[model samples]
Target: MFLVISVVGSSNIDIVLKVDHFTKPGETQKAIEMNVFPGGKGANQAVTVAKIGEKGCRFVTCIGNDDYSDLLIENYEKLGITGYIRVSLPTGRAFIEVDKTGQNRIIIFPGANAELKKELIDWNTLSESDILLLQNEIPFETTLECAKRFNGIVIFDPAPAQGINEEIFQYLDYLTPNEKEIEALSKDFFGEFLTVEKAAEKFLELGVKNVIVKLGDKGVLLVNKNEKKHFPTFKVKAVDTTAAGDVFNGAFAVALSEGKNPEEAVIFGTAAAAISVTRLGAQSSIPAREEVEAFLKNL
Candidate 1:
């Protein structure tokens, strides 16, 4: 059995809505459509790995004792996720509004996800074979401690780009950050069009072993020892960009555990993400292993 572990960084109820146009802060706007889905950075990644790979994936997170938590757990069970989450505070929440072009604006209320501390993590229950996935949803110290404790490859996705610093870069085996995050780390006023070569050079010079700059709709760029390789994204129509990044990260970890190298893992992840873009919701959009294989076969 292939053993994979992901210390999912968040578990939240996502409130999704469709608007004719962007909502103005002071203007009243009526939502044309709305729905709720189970989402969080960690949970999305967990489902992505569990469904797209023929392996056992474990999710490390916390939830509330509410009915929403029950629904989330049920969904997890349906996807074959094991019992590894901690029921700490109430479940977290996200409010997302999408426009006609599938672009989105999100507001998150971090409930239990904000309370994850190193004291609550159970280290004895995990092993090195498991790949540890991380995001900025959890506490900083918690991510650092888990990275140091786990003997597997640690993939850090610095989303929501806040409070990032140099000290945190040392513990990360692979640092995956989007364009916005890279600018936040650099504190640069670099305009809209940016390249992975420019982004990775900064992180690589800062002493990171591997720096991956995620360019949505463009592709992923890898930086190592002053060399750069750009990985192209699979061509697909994006419906909601909700958890595509999370799915990509999860698929990457799964591919790594299944003996694929970094570049191969990125290709696998790109395929999985391409599949997710054609559908709606986060965990719900992740295709099964057979489906993913068929998609790649026909590609």
Candidate 2:
């Protein structure tokens, strides 16, 4: 059977600036450089799957009526991604700053992303064998609707973590969060400082089937009721990390749809992220499946 993967989330135009340090109060700071790209957690992930996977990827999201929509749509079209665009307010925007030490400070304006209605998702169209990829950038209600209604595998990436309704956990097949995101998500739920293992346990208690915590240098940790596995990262000189997590989620979803088990899937996703950080930009940093395979082979 051919598995299908669908992503529902926000689409944004990313404005990036290179700065030596974070801008301070009332100071005139000139960025070393400026760049623009089509990005958003949703767009990045969709681009990842589209570029790396051979076929069977669908992306649905809200984009603005503005000019950026043309750019985003064109990019999607070029990638052979046929998406349903729901438009209203201006397209989403993300303003980001990358420092000399490779740290990033970002701000997002929801715009059309927040405008997606919960009733918009056609949950009945998907089956249990299909996969649904979701992120927090879109309306939380819509995300919850998909989680509750979709009769398929669900993978949620709680990036830029926010308080979530506990009900969403039991419906999820996979939950991927970075170290910081996991800390934020677990601290609010468990009400105490806990180790990574304990924090992941809290997610399991809430009914999450599998929890994948992305530890930067320490690699990825996959925990379930049965066993725990660790996947070490590839060491490389990183230039920009704007899309590391999104790259991981994108490749991860494709791997799952391609019938890779959780353990092999994490390794494939980890290699994708490792290769992404070695480059720059959001979608620009993502590596194709062949590149990822070659990378893993060389390792």
Candidate 3:
């Protein structure tokens, strides 16, 4: 049986700027350079699976009727990714800044992404053997609906931190969140000062099978009822951290779908993300499966 990994999320045109530092309040700053790339956490993860997992990946999202949609469509075609793209509103967009130390900040305008309806997803296509990837960029109801109906591995990357409803927990197989996102979730549920372990435990207690926390350069942490493990990161010269987390989630999904254990999946994801930060952009920076394989071999 072929492993099918479906991604239900947002698609956006990313406008990136190189800056010395983040601008202050009411302060104007000049960018050293600028570029546009195809992005969106959903799209990036889908692209990751397509590039690394190949024919097994299916991407579902919405694109606008505007000029930017051409770029996104062309890129998807070039990558040989099959997308369930809907055309209705103007395309979604993101404004991003990369500083000298590879730090990044972004502002998102949920244009067409916000308009992605639950009906856009073909629930009949899902199966127990598949893997579903989702993010917070789209409406919660759509994600919840898919999770509720799909009898598969549901990977939820709850980004742009917001309080999560308990109803969503039962369907989550894996919950991937970054440091600040974990803190936000913890604060929302358990108040402040909760340790990372306790915070991840809180998620486990809510019915989630696994809590994988992205720790930036500090590496990754995996927590479940049985045990908690921290995976050390691979060292590399950082350039742009844009979509590094997305890369991790995508690669992790690919690994899991291929039947790799959680520990091995984290290593694969870490290598992919490590390589992404050494370059620029989101989808453009993701290394191929062969590239990641060689990277791991050399390590």
Top-lDDT candidate index: 3
Which tens-of-lDDT digit does each residue in 1-299 have in candidate 3?
A: 54578898989888888899888899899999998888889999989988887763677888887789887887778777666575778899888888987678988888888877787776676553388898888888888888778788899999767745657877899999899999988888777746888899988988999999999999999999888999999999999887999999989989988889989999999999999999976788999999899999997
The residue pairs that clash in candidate 2, if any, are none
lDDT tens per residue, model 1, 143-219: 77887787777788988678654566666778888877777766642333355577666666656678888788989
Q: Which candidate leads in TM-score?
A: 2
Worst 10 residues of 2 by lDDT: 120-129
Candidate 1: give the clashing pairs: none
* TM-scores of the models, in the order given: 0.86, 0.92, 0.90
User: What CA RMSD would you report for each candidate?
Assistant: 3.3, 2.3, 2.9
* Model 1 residue 272 CA deviation in Å: 0.9
Candidate 3 or 2, higher TM-score = 2
Task: Quantify all predictions' global Cα lDDT against the true fold.
Answer: 0.78, 0.85, 0.85
Each candidate's clash count: 0, 0, 0
Model 3 Cα displacement at 261 (Å)?
Answer: 1.4
Native-vs-model 3 lDDT? 0.85
